[PDB]
Amino acid sequence: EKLVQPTPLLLSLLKSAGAQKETFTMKEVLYHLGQYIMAKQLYDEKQQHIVHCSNDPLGELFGVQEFSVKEHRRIYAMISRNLVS
Numbered sequence: 001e002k003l004v005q006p007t008p009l010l011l012s013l014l015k016s017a018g019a020q021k022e023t024f025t026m027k028e029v030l031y032h033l034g035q036y037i038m039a040k041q042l043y044d045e046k047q048q049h050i051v052h053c054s055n056d057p058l059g060e061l062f063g064v065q066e067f068s069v070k071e072h073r074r075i076y077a078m079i080s081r082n083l084v085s
């Protein structure tokens with residue numbers, strides 16, 4: 001029931017992926033980032049479950065060359081870096 005507010009940088013990525021508003025449930029943020037990841041071809045299905053983002057804006061906001069989509073605690077933390085409230 002908590003609505004979070006992406007920073008301007010993260011918000012721009014979400015909107016490029018099709019997001020329409022300025023605040024979101026965490027589930028919505030994860031959904032739009034999933035769409036962003038697929039749009040930028042950072043993830044290949046049925047391989048190692050790795051997001052490869054070293055050359056993408058996402059890599060900087062998160063701070064990585066890659067991460068596993070199974071590392072959910074880490075992903076929540078990397079998203080949290082990019083929230084206002």
Ligand SMILES: CC(C)(C)C[C@@H]1N[C@@H](C(=O)Nc2ccc(C(N)=O)cc2)[C@H](c2cccc(Cl)c2F)[C@]12C(=O)Nc1cc(Cl)ccc12
Pocket residue numbers: 029030031033034035037038043049051069070071072073075076
């Ligand atoms: C990269 C794809 C697959 C397009 C989306 C990812 N699929 C979700 C996922 O967990 N995929 C997955 C795929 C395959 C297997 C397997 N074969 O064992 C296990 C897990 C993952 C996720 C869901 C819910 C909470 C979190 Cl924190 C999360 F990271 C997932 C998601 O739903 N959104 C999201 C956003 C970021 Cl930044 C990063 C990641 C996502």
